[PDB]
Each structure stands twice: as C-alpha cells, then as structure tokens.
Amino acid sequence: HSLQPQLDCGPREIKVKVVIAYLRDPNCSSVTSPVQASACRNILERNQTHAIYKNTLSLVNDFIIRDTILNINFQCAYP
Amino acid sequence: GEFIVRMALFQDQNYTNPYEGDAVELSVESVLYVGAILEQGDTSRFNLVLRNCYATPTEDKADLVKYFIIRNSCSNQRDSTIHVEENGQSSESRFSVQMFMFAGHYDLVFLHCEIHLCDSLNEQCQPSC
Amino acid sequence: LDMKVSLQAALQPIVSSLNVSVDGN
Ligand SMILES: *[C@@H]1O[C@H](CO)[C@@H](O)[C@H](O)[C@H]1NC(C)=O
Ligand SMILES: *[C@@H]1O[C@H](CO)[C@@H](O)[C@H](O)[C@H]1NC(C)=O
Ligand SMILES: *[C@@H]1O[C@H](CO)[C@@H](O)[C@H](O)[C@H]1NC(C)=O
C-alpha cells in the first residue's frame, strides 16, 4: 500500500495533501500546519546539523470510527 | 429517598455471566451489552424507561461533544447498529451498541444515562416510537 | 422519579490501522 502523500514543506507552513483529518492536537482540522513548533503539536527533532518537524496526521471517515484510520506520519527535514 | 438504579456490562447477547468490570477492552468492530437494571427498588410495579442513555469521552456528564446512543427516550438514529432489546416494561432495560471511539486524541469512552421510573398502574407509558 | 445513572467502567478500544510515513525537505 502507498498513498504518495504530497508533502511540500514551505518556509512558514508545512502542507500535506493526500473524511476529517487532524494533527496530534485536535485542532488544525481543515491539511496545513504552521512550522512554529508551538502549534498543533509539531514534534521537533534536531538531529545534528538539521531540524526535522515530525507529525502524525490522522484521517478518519467520521468523528466516530469503525476499524479504519489513516495514520500518516510525515516529517519535514529543513536545513 | 433514592431508588438507586444500577447498570452493568455483559459480554455477550447472552444476558448473564457478564463482565465484572474494571476497564473493558473491545474491538472497535465488537459489540458490548449494557442494561439498566432497577435493582434495589420497588420492582413490583415500577418499570424503568431508558430516556437519555448517551456516551461522552469524559467522566463528567457535561461535555461539548457526546455520543447520543439513544436520545428522545428511544433508538437514536444515525447509528448503523443500535438495538434497544427490552427497554421499558421490565425492571431491566437492555440495549446494544457497537464499540467506538471519538475524534481527536483520547481513548476513553464512557456511558451516561437518564432514567425515568414509569409505573404500570393506569399509566400507559410504555416507551412507544 | 428521574434519576441519572452512569456506567462504572471505561471502554477501551483497540482501534488500529495502516501506518504510513513520508519525507520532505
Ligand atoms: C480547538 O478549537 C476549538 C474551537 O472549535 C476550541 O474550543 C478549543 O479551545 C481549541 N483547542 C485547542 C487545543 O486549540
Ligand atoms: C538526520 O536525518 C536526515 C533525514 O534525511 C538526514 O538527512 C541527516 O543526515 C540526519 N543527520 C545525521 C547527523 O545523520
Ligand atoms: C447462553 O445462555 C445462557 C444465558 O443466556 C448462558 O448461561 C449460557 O452459558 C450461554 N451460552 C453460551 C454463551 O454459549
């Protein structure tokens, strides 16, 4: 399986295109996310001489769900 | 006084040998069987209707979002699999829902209900719908 | 005649699905 989720790290917005979707923190529900690490719970991992913004978007058919979620774990590796 | 009403969780459509109940783990596809019982009460003529059994992702009964389970005294719509088996006449009222868990990030689903104690003497309040 | 009743347990599902991962610069 593969979706080819188009992730397009910008200078101020992380944007991931691929039902309601939401980031780790319940808002940012439309998919965009500000690059500010204090916004919708973006994970910061500064491995040496780089900085990656990891996040786990989730797609669910209805706000109640039955046996099917879409846990898209996308990261942005900035210089 | 207080007509203390209790409700438990049974494991099967089989309405006995239920779960003891501390924190139940279920397949989202699976089914659970909760029945409101009028234990420790009149039970000779007082029925037990199921008016507003509902669900919410918080111990508190006052949440912004909450699952309906059954509104307006019976059989909430919008749910594919709902069965109020014997709510109403008997001192035991039973209904079945498929497991679920809400939007956002919290795996904590709770069940809350509102119960009105009908009587079966010259009071035709069988819950009709 | 209109008391409120709650279930004394937590309903913990085992919802799980297809993990995905991607990269970007
Ligand atoms: C999420 O947005 C709702 C408005 O829909 C607001 O009530 C709530 O405080 C927000 N929560 C966070 C963590 O931003
Ligand atoms: C950190 O991870 C990125 C991911 O592509 C990689 O390019 C980089 O080499 C890693 N840093 C180190 C020090 O290995
Ligand atoms: C079903 O019937 C009774 C009560 O419903 C129970 O004692 C019996 O063990 C059950 N049989 C099963 C679950 O196979």
Author numbering:
A (entry chain C): 221 to 238, 252 to 263, 275 to 323
B (entry chain B): 349 to 477
C (entry chain A): 224 to 248
Q: What does the report in the manuscript say about this coordinate set?
A:
Glycoprotein 2 (GP2) shares a high degree of sequence similarity with UMOD (53% sequence identity), and has been recognized as a paralog of UMOD resulting from gene duplication. GP2 is expressed and secreted by the pancreas and serves a similar antibacterial function in the digestive tract as UMOD does in the urinary tract.
In the cryo-EM structure of GP2, the bipartite zona pellucida (ZP) modules (residues 221−478) comprise the filament core. The D10C and EGF-like domains extend outward from the filament core as flexible branches, and no high-resolution densities are observed around these regions. Additionally, two loops on the ZPN domains (residues 239−251 and 264−274) are also flexible and lack well-defined densities, likely because their conformations are influenced by the flexible branch regions. Each ZP module within GP2 filaments is symmetrically related to the adjacent module with a helical twist of approximately 177.2 degrees and a helical rise of approximately 66.3 Å. To form filaments, the ZPN and ZPC domains from a given ZP module are separated by an extended linker (residues 324−348), a ZPC domain from the previous ZP module (ZPC−1), and a ZPN domain from the subsequent ZP module (ZPN+1). These regions assemble through a β-sheet complementation mechanism, where the first and second β-strands in linker region (L1 and L2) complemented the fold of ZPC−1, and the third β-strand in linker region complemented the fold of ZPN+1. The side chain interactions between linker region, ZPC−1, and ZPN+1 are predominantly hydrophobic, with some additional electrostatic interactions.
